[PDB]
Amino acid sequence: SLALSQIEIQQFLSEAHAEFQSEGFLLQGAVRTKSGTKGSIVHFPVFG
Amino acid sequence: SLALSQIEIQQFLSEAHAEFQSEGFLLQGAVRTKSGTKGSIVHFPVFG
Fold first, then answer.
1. B45 and which of A7, A41, B24, B37 could share a cystine (Cβ 3.0–4.6 Å)?
2. Are B48 and A3 a contacting pair at CB < 8 A?
3. Which residues of A9-45 are buried (b: 16+ CB within 10 A; e: fewer)?
C-alpha cells in the first residue's frame, strides 16, 4: 500500500560537523619563545 | 544490685521503616512497554 509513507523514518548521523573555524596556533614559533616558564612575570633584559 | 538499671543500654535498629507509600511500577505490564529507546520523541508505527 502507498500508505506506508505515513510511517517513514528519519536518520540522524553520528558524525558531527564543526563550523569552519581556525584551529589556532598559527603564530607558534613566530616570535622569541620561552617554554616551561614559572612565575607571574617573565623579564627580558634589554641593552641600548 | 538493682542499681544496675542506672547503666542500662538502648538498642537502635538498622532496618528502617518507610512511611506507607507506593513502591511504583504498578502499571508496568498493564501497558505496552518498550525498553532501551532513544531520542526525544519515540514513534510507534501502526498498521491497519
1. A7
2. yes
3. eeeeeeeeeeeeeeeeeeeeeeeeeeeeeeeeeeeee
